[PDB]
Amino acid sequence: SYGIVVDPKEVVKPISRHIYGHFTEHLGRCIYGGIYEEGSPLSDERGFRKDVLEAVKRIKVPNLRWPGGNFVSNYHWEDGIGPKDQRPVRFDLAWQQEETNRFGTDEFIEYCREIGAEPYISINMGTGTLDEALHWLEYCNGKGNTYYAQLRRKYGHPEPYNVKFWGIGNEMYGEWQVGHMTADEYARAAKEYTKWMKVFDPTIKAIAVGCDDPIWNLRVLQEAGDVIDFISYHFYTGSDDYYETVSTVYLLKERLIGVKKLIDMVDTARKRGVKIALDEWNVWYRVSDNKLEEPYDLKDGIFACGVLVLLQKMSDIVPLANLAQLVNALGAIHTEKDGLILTPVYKAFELIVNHSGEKLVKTHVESETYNIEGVMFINKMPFSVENAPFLDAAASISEDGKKLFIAVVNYRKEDALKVPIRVEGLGQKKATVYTLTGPDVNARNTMENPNVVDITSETITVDTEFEHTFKPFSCSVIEVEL
Amino acid sequence: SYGIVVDPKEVVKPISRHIYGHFTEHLGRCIYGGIYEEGSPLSDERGFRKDVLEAVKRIKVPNLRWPGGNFVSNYHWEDGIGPKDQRPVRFDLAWQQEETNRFGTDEFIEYCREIGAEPYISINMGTGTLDEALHWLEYCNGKGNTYYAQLRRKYGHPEPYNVKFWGIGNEMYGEWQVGHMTADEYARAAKEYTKWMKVFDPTIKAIAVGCDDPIWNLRVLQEAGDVIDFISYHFYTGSDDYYETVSTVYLLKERLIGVKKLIDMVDTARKRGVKIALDEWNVWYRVSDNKLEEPYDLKDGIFACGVLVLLQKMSDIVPLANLAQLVNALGAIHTEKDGLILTPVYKAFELIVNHSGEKLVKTHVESETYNIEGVMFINKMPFSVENAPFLDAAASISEDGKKLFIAVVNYRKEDALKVPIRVEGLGQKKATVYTLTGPDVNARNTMENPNVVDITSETITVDTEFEHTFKPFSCSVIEVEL
Ligand SMILES: OC[C@@H]1O[C@@H](O)[C@H](O)[C@H]1O
Ligand SMILES: OC[C@@H]1O[C@@H](O)[C@H](O)[C@H]1O
Ligand SMILES: OC[C@@H]1O[C@@H](O)[C@H](O)[C@H]1O
Ligand SMILES: OC[C@@H]1O[C@@H](O)[C@H](O)[C@H]1O
Ligand SMILES: OC[C@@H]1O[C@@H](O)[C@H](O)[C@H]1O
Ligand SMILES: OC[C@@H]1O[C@@H](O)[C@H](O)[C@H]1O
Ligand SMILES: OC[C@@H]1O[C@@H](O)[C@H](O)[C@H]1O
Ligand SMILES: OC[C@@H]1O[C@@H](O)[C@H](O)[C@H]1O
């Protein structure tokens, strides 16, 4: 009644490297006090916090979304370029604070370069215009002698940045968004901004705004499905109950199959192969203020593992995802003036990113399942999930075919699972199992005790057939040389 | 690379008996000269063709849809009740025929009772009204002293008919439909007809019109998803190419999944468990006139077995389906004045209906798959399907646990397939394998040659593990005791 069968020789499909994306918004101390802190003993001469920088390089960020989020829908990018001392101080409506703009476009790109991530910039469709968006694209990507390409060179960067991912607005349906639009307004505006941006630079990928309103998604696909590359989806979840939290991996799964089906229902979008960008996701239910310093625990980390395993299996449909967010705001990493904490949600990434392959292989899982009705999110909205598994898994192999990674999540709250595993054509080998867990479902790391929740390993012997015992509330990756 | 693993002890879910339903429209010779022929040497005293009756009873019709189809949208049911000699001749706009109304509601119910089928009545939303629908329902189902209940008694039937299935309109989106409606009009009207019909009889099930326009489906679900029980889907397919035909089983599958996901995205409909009625489906690509006498061949037969196997596996989502149509019009059975022909589409049902269980058991199938771009239907619309299997199967057990049915489709056009089969805990035993196929993919039955395409049987030996070889373009059921 539990079991895993893997066939390393049967490659199902690629795993998009961009499922492991991240997001830094100008929110609270995400930027200021987070990744960037001018004159800290802990910061380099660009103002980047070095301890943060090290934590971020460790999770090999493939792409990084900035600057929003609600923030961007009242952000004028030209306020954040040029000599820092000449940049205007603005009041940010999203999160109600003074924004000095000392972190702007050039610093963001320098940050992305430093960490090896592709920049992914959202534009302002709230108080912003088409002209303003085209100017940002011109500044970032122009090769010629246009005013904004020259301005990039003038401020110190002759080579174009070549930003590939552009978000065509953020959450434009929500009445919390500055300049929020009806479905018909937004669908027409997404087509409009995307087509002219692609006229200036045909190489960009355009992510249009999606949500849970199927009519909204359909208007966007209908109107703009001939020019956009992704429709986005945001997913925030969680409650105090362990199972209500982790079970929502499978709520998310059904949501995404839904949006994939709407894409199939619009001919031009289906034929062009428009995909989904899960460009914000996380647990978020405890804290509701202007800083969002959600104290993630292990339960939340298991949720994050479950999603990464899901995305490995579904990346042909959802090739781009972004955890919200990297530092402090809904933060994977939490900083103080004199240190940082790695939350269990960061650990989910540290585990999967470092112990996963580039191709998904055939993985058949047998599992007991459970039904649940709970609440999620800061408003405690009822949901329900049917036949959520207690055990999930994804087997992948490295590009060179030399390594197999069997990622396994045991969602059971109280019982360890003894799981029979078959791997086709595998000899007897020593292998290492890397496990994320901790003493209880509510364990957290603190400055006090930075390592209560961490990745530990043990060596085991594997064969064509073997059993392993997976701890309750844990994610493990079995790593095997082929 | 091909294989079937069955566990008879793991019941996955019920198989709704209503997936084997049928449909007789007042179109061409489906009624007059089809199921019904007054004064024929081949007819009983009710005017029912006795040779047709025998063939229909052989396929154990669980429900029968009537009178349309396009016909019902200009049909006034009161024209079809009372002494036949006084019923008015009407011009049917849908098929351009004089309709004598000599076959009407009372004859239909009597036909249903003869064959043992639940009546499924579609109402007229084209030229009809709410009152007129309510009067039909009251005539059929009233057990009190209302005028129309008394009227049914007056015409000879004191007991109510208890019609359980009501179709709220037919294809009301189509410009071909008399009185066709926009999505908003139909959505509101479906809610209105359904709610008041259910005030008079709350035990009926109501099927609302769906189609391939996702905005249409969603307006119906949003407006009426609190009262309806199914949204209907119609699927017609085929071309002269063998694989282009049979592969559309998996195009159907994806269509159905998409409609299922629309349901999931409408809170009231999802919570209430609204399902799908596939209330018209068949091959239909060669004939385009007002008689629709489509010459089905074996290829179309294998398509139909293929849909039946799919429906056994998805009947919790699609509990009701009706092949269009039973006799002559797109007909499973073809009649002439002096006899009939059982087409291979009829043989599909003769096989599955007689060799299937009421419960679906754990069935895992391994199979090579293919991709195809083809054309379908009378307009030769292009379609594409990804990873269709060459082999598929479903295993079911009888209600009393005594029998196991393994239905297997081999879609391979050219090669037999020796296939390993595992049945958990199965003794070594004798089984009978019933198989449907014929000389070639374009084989048909005729009056001359009525058994070119027929079901054969041979005894075989089965065990916990055995192999069986399946003919190309064939469907078989392995019927095992215990
Ligand atoms: O990530 C926090 C907020 O969540 C979403 O509502 C917004 O896009 C973002 O600003
Ligand atoms: O801010 C998170 C929000 O909760 C949901 O209603 C919004 O659509 C989603 O973006
Ligand atoms: O209450 C709405 C919650 O915010 C969103 O992220 C969740 O998906 C949505 O259901
Ligand atoms: O079955 C023939 C026709 O096909 C569908 O378009 C109509 O509902 C039916 O009258
Ligand atoms: O008449 C069969 C039809 O082909 C499709 O366009 C219609 O919607 C379907 O009912
Ligand atoms: O081209 C219209 C065809 O008629 C319908 O039955 C098929 O689904 C549709 O694609
Ligand atoms: O498999 C054939 C069917 O089983 C029998 O009961 C039916 O009469 C026969 O036609
Ligand atoms: O002829 C096929 C019939 O179907 C089976 O149920 C009957 O026993 C067999 O006679």
UniProtKB/TrEMBL annotation, chains A, B:
GO terms, molecular function: alpha-L-arabinofuranosidase activity
Spans through the membrane: none
Disulfide bonds: 305-475
Keyword Hydrolase: yes
Database matches in Pfam families: Alpha-L-AF_C, ASD1_dom
An example Gene Ontology biological process: L-arabinose metabolic process
Record's keyword annotation contains Membrane: no
InterPro entries: Alpha-L-AF_C (IPR010720), ASD1_cat (IPR055235), GH (IPR017853), Glyco_hydro_b (IPR013780)
Coiled coil: none
Superkingdom, taxonomy of origin: Bacteria
Domain Alpha-L-arabinofuranosidase C-terminal: 279-474
Top enzyme category: hydrolase
UniProt xrefs under SMART domains: Alpha-L-AF_C (SM00813)
EC number: 3.2.1.55
Keyword terms, alphabetized: Carbohydrate metabolism, Glycosidase, Hydrolase
Gene3D superfamilies in alphabetical order: Glycosidases (3.20.20.80), Golgi alpha-mannosidase II (2.60.40.1180)
Catalytic activity: Hydrolysis of terminal non-reducing alpha-L-arabinofuranoside residues in alpha-L-arabinosides
Family, similarity comment: Belongs to the glycosyl hydrolase 51 family.
Assembly and oligomerization: Homohexamer; trimer of dimers.
Protein name: non-reducing end alpha-L-arabinofuranosidase
Taxonomic placement: Bacteria, Thermotogati, Thermotogota, Thermotogae, Thermotogales
